[PDB]
């Protein structure tokens, strides 16, 4: 028995048989259930029970150190088997988790131990992060609850008619009229009522309407609001994750006023740019530790011929990229003839290499066999669809391109780790897809009526393909909208599902992929006086002040400027003065540094360009020609030199300057890969996004209009989608939209509906085209776009070493020891004298630990009391809460008074005591003045009452892990501020230029009455939104329009309302590259460096707390 049990278990055939059974079961889970699937379920269950029985007989159940149930994997198998028995012998929800067994398959891929251990270690080390996350989210939720309670219910209600149609006015007749939903303003074809508010800059009502509150529901089926603490918590989490956050941003600002942008700036800065980077750092350290442990464990054959082939390949790629939709016959002929020629040259090349070089030698080389495969593919394609394989030719460019060659070599060196990570990602997605299918599949069918038109949404859980796609979209970072649909047809269970999917997929697996990439990819008198003046500090300060003031003046040139003649005169005179000032400054600098030194530096070249532009404007004005706004806007570029000289700014600017070349290389490689995908997409979807629409832009059924001819016969419109794959340029723009996950849903919808050219698209007739996007996203977004952050992380590490004076040749341990040695020097103790008998007794009582624990409990209770407030609460509830808070204030004041008596003048030696003292004073004063302030603006009352939250911030005091993380943040504050300062300056430059370019465009897409480029503030609102790439497709659609817009009339002074496609493309693409992909990623770099240092101090060295403990006994 035992002999047989042990012997059978140890056989590899046993494990292989079980694993193959699991894989077959996985296949059967995908297809819809039938009777055959049922009998298969019994067979599979029997095999699993056999395995469990054998293992128990060999080891034993639990009672010995090496028993069956002493292994976590055995625990998983045991639980799944029991649940299968429960579901067969006797709720439908428990049977989904059978799929969990598939996790075992991760052991097939060699090297899985490293990745699995890295995942487990990352999960274990996120303990200290989760508590700080929950605390910060709750604080932000309370702030938002105080700020926006009930704001999302604002609506424009028609005035009570004065004609008497509804009857003579009465209070209840007025309430009846206003409560009717048919009197709330909503544009035709809209789903949501627009928001409003009477604060300056908020949404306005049409004539005959008034902005009221407390009517109807909140946006998004009522799931988006700040009315209760729970909903506020959900909104704050969404905002921190940047999940469709521009919608909430726009709703809140339209309802409350533009100033509330401040709230969003804080949450985004602290939540997104700092905390998520803490998670990234923790994952990176986990992976690095695991890899360290694993590693420690342990004619033709002439250059000219090659050059000729290289140019032939380049020409061939150009020809392949010139294919487009509706080509003329001449273009077709040229492209086909070139293809024939290129194929002939390749064939001749192959034969020549086989003759000059030995066939054995030829086929010994890898590049040669690749070329031969291309040759046979070309012959097969021309003989007889195999045109897709033509793309292989492009990869031949890697041989002659050193950068691409090196990139591919690095990819090949450590492929096993990438295979493991991708397999884990796909297995997790598969498990979640099966679970969600079982949990929510029938809800969509049964409760279809609840959807807006009673129609099934594109994204759902009906079948395996849709479930996989929806969970994959969640992993990409979009989860809240799917969760809204799930709740709409389902229940609360949707919330834990999606959140889990977002947490594991995006914050761990994707960050682990980043860690992998990081680990792998990484007269004499005149001269004298001019020189003395130039080197003088006062002169430089005066120049900087002039530049700053004039740049600030540039911001006042908004749409209303013509209505302010005084401002017009001030601007013109300042222009003249600036022209003179620039000329004089240039002469002085030339006299000081000389011609060679002046004309060999980049900063002086920028100054010179500004001078030349202003002189050109001067002559134009003299001649009677209107000044060029673009030229006179060039002076803002003078702002970067003083900015670069700001304290602590050197590290940031030096890092960016050093990273520039690597960024260029990454962009080139990305352009190549995106070209491959763009050619493929043009071949797949060129000319297939046309559809038939009527007077209202609504797509007709394929039944009424089968194709274009019917569409035109009924006098319908055959229209193209704005984003398409008609030619390579359009494909590039569409792929940029796909990679950033902004506007991608429309593109994918058009793709999966596509049919043959000149045929009405049908819903989901080509579903498998989803695959094309998946691949692109994996190789274009998860791999290529993440190289920028790796580059910045490495370069900032080097530059910060430079700034502190550290040596590049020193090792990690030496720096740990050097830091310890530096710390040991500075340390001084102190003692407090016990009090006199009564004062001394109080001293002992307060100095006890139980006192502080009690205070912490009181802080938690006060926080809960704050969490109870909700919109529409009763007045009695309001009074009760006020009195509870008063009692808490009295207790805290007593604690402070007792500490003051106990510690006398020593009380103020500790900073936390000063914070607590200030909080106590604020609390007393507010408790006294609450009614006076409220009775004698509601917005002002809410904002000032925010100070009440100060006395729950004392909860962080006393913790350990939170203290360590906060120490890292405090150590990095200067650099984070400098990065933000640079970001704001870039935003300012873009704001003035965007105001010049797009201030008169017509309302379309994301541009409307409230959000536009008409003023500096509105431009900044939009640009802050776009710094995260949020909603850049809608802005592009607004600013790039050139259709159905009237041209400017100089004679009549009409400015025009037309957009510009080229200008909009340049503007938005450059902004996305500069901010989203570079400057923002500096945050990650900074955070990672500092966090790592602190952790290495705590683990492999000494920390300040260690010295404090040593001096505690001293
Ligand atoms: C994901 C990462 C899981 C952690 C990794 C792991 O397997 O560790 C635990 C252990 C291995 O332990 P060690 O021995 O330390 O590792 C060395 C290998 N001998 O494995 C197990 O116990 C396996 C069980 C994990 C299965 C993972 C399943 C993931 C899917 C979760 C779905 C959640 C659904 C939630 C929806 C809620 C709806 C209301
Ligand atoms: C605090 C800083 C706020 C400064 C803002 C200056 C605003 C100046 C101004 O013009 O105010 C306009 C306007 C007043 O509008 P009303 O006339 O009431 O119109 C209502 C409808 N008729 O002001 C606003 O709306 C400003 C609101 C901005 C609030 C943003 C809050 C930002 C973050 C707060 C976090 C604080 C947390 C505290 C932490 C702990 C403290 C110990
Ligand atoms: C790994 C990841 C684990 C994820 C699991 C944690 C999430 C579980 C949350 C359960 C919430 C219960 C839902 C029921 C509920 O009422 O919750 C409060 C509230 C609704 O309150 P009421 O106004 O009474 O609703 C009725 C009004 N129409 O629900 C919410 O929106 C809560 C959502 C919480 C978001 C959490 C996401 C962040 C988690 C951090 C990790
Ligand atoms: C489309 C309409 C709007 C377009 C507006 C574009 C805005 C772009 C803003 C950024 C660039 C502005 C011009 C800067 C000119 C640089 C001149 C120069 O000498 O550069 C080197 C100089 C080194 O200074 P030193 O005195 O040697 O050292 C002291 C450092 N404290 O650089 C700086 O300090 C410049 C730092 C600015 C950041 C620019 C890099 C970030 C963007 C790169 C991404 C794209 C790469 C491909
Ligand atoms: C820094 C980068 C700055 C970018 C500079 C762009 C300059 C502007 C050029 C635009 C010229 C233009 O408007 O040409 C239009 C012409 C098409 O004309 P249609 O009227 O659509 O023809 C009929 C279609 N059915 O061409 C285009 O659409 C050009 C599109 C340009 C590509 C933009 C995307 C760039 C992607 C960046 C690379 C990302 C990967 C790197 C990582
Ligand atoms: C140095 C870094 C770390 C911080 C940069 C400071 C910003 C927070 C400041 C700079 C410019 C400010 C903006 C300047 C102009 C406006 C317009 C203002 O709204 C109005 O124009 C009110 C009048 C109306 O809406 O009718 C709202 C504040 C806002 C967006 C300001 C919000 C705060 C901003 C972004
Ligand atoms: C400068 C002075 C000042 C300002 C001005 Cl403009 C005029 C004067 Cl004369 C004085 N500030 C200082 C800050 C104060 C902050 O405000 C609160 C503080 C609170 F702790 C509570 C509270 O705890 N509430 S509770 C019991 O929990 O319900 C509530 C409030 C708000 C006021 C209701 C307000 C007074
Ligand atoms: C929506 C609504 O409640 N409308 C009521 C109506 O049912 C009632 O008959 C009438 C008489 O007072 O008042 C109003
Ligand atoms: C709202 O007003 C319309 C028109 O007067 C009326 O038909 C409708 O019944 C009203 N709504 C309710 C809920 O009575
Ligand atoms: O009951 C309707 C209520 O409407 C509001 C106020 O005018 C109240 O005085 C009135 O009672």
Curated annotation (Swiss-Prot):
Cystine connections: 156-205, 196-211, 486-494, 692-711, 1045-1058
Sugar-modified residues: 168, 176, 180, 198, 460, 696, 709, 715
Keywords: Cell membrane, Disulfide bond, Glycoprotein, Ion channel, Ion transport, Membrane, Repeat, Sodium, Sodium channel, Sodium transport, Transmembrane, Transmembrane helix, Transport, Voltage-gated channel
Intramembrane annotation, residue ranges: 229-253, 464-484, 729-750, 1016-1038
GO biological process terms on file: membrane depolarization during action potential; neuronal action potential
Signal peptide (UniProt feature, chain positions): none
Residues where tetrodotoxin binds: 478, 481, 743, 1031, 1033
Chain residue ranges for the region called Linker region that may regulate channel inactivation: 814-827
GO MF assignments: voltage-gated monoatomic cation channel activity; voltage-gated sodium channel activity
Family per record: Belongs to the sodium channel (TC 1.A.1.10) family.
Record's function text: Mediates the voltage-dependent sodium ion permeability of excitable membranes.
Name of the featured protein: Sodium channel protein PaFPC1
Organism per entry: Periplaneta americana
